[PDB]
C-alpha cells in the first residue's frame, strides 16, 4: 500500500497508512489546497507562488518559501497542520471579509478535521462529524485520487464558477480548537479569540472534496456570496 509516482513524492508522503505520515499528509494537504485557493482566487499575486506538480496530469501554484510574506503564510499553515499530530485542530478556514475584523464573512474556504482512534477505524467524539465518520481508509492510491479531485475542484470552482472578489477585502486564517485541546496549548501565529466567523442567511455552500488517509479525515467546503 504505497504510491509509486515521481510527481507525488515531491509534495506528499508515498505512504499515509501509519498515524504519523497520515498527519504529515494532512499538513502537506493543507499547504497545497490553501495555496491553490490563495492563487486561484487572486488573493495573492502569482509572484508569491511557485508552480508545482501533484500529478503529471495536474499543476497548481504553491506558496514560495523564498518569498518572505508567502513564507509567513506557509509557516502559519505549517503550524496549523502540525496541530493535527496532537489532534488539537477542529477546523482551519480561509476567511474573506469586506472590512478588517468582521465576524461575518463574504467568502469562506473551510477545512474540517476528524481524528480516528487506534488503527484508524473509530472516530473520536458537530454537523460535519457523521459523514466523515462513515468513511473507511482505502489505500494511498485512493487518497491520491481524492487530493487530485480536491485540487481540480478548487481550480474549476475559482475560475469557472465563482465571481471575482470585490476591489477591497480582508482575508485571514481563522481556526477552531478541539475540545481536548489544553488551555496552555496555542498554535503559533494564531492569537486566541472569542469569535470565529459567521455567514449570511442566504450564502451559497458547495463541497470541494475530502481526504481519508490512515487515521485522519478532512472535509473541504466553500461558502460564498460572490457565487
Amino acid at each position: 500500500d504505497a504510491i509509486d509516482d515521481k510527481t507525488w513524492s515531491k509534495l506528499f508522503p508515498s505512504i499515509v497508512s501509519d498515524p504519523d505520515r497520515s498527519s504529515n499528509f494532512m499538513i502537506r494537504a493543507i499547504y497545497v489546497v490553501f495555496s491553490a485557493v490563495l492563487r486561484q482566487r487572486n488573493i495573492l499575486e502569482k509572484e508569491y507562488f511557485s508552480k508545482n506538480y501533484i500529478t503529471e496530469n495536474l499543476s497548481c501554484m504553491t506558496l514560495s518559501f523564498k518569498n518572505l510574506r508567502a513564507h509567513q503564510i506557509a509557516q502559519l499553515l505549517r503550524a496549523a497542520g502540525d496541530a493535527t499530530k496532537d489532534g488539537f485542530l477542529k477546523e482551519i478556514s480561509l476567511v474573506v471579509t469586506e472590512h478588517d475584523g468582521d465576524v461575518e464573512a463574504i467568502e469562506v474556504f473551510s477545512m474540517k478535521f476528524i481524528y480516528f482512534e487506534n488503527g484508524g477505524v473509530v472516530a473520536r467524539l458537530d454537523p460535519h462529524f457523521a459523514e466523515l465518520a462513515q468513511l473507511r481508509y482505502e489505500g494511498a492510491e485512493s487518497v491520491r485520487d481524492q487530493m487530485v479531485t480536491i485540487v481540480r475542484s478548487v481550480q474549476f470552482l475559482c475560475t469557472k464558477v465563482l465571481e471575482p472578489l470585490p476591489a477591497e477585502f480582508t482575508a485571514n486564517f481563522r481556526l477552531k480548537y478541539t475540545n481536548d485541546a489544553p488551555s496552555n496549548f496555542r498554535i503559533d501565529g494564531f492569537d486566541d479569540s472569542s469569535t470565529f466567523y459567521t455567514l449570511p442567511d442566504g450564502i451559497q455552500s458547495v463541497t470541494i472534496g475530502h481526504l481519508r488517509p490512515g487515521h485522519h479525515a478532512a472535509h473541504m467546503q466553500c461558502w460564498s456570496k460572490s457565487m
Binding site: I43, A171, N172, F173, L175, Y177, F190, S193
Partner: peptide, 9 residues
C-alpha cells in the same frame, strides 16, 4: 468555545 486568528491581506 475556543478560537484562533491570523492577519493576511
Amino acid at each position: 468555545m475556543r478560537y484562533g486568528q491570523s492577519p493576511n491581506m
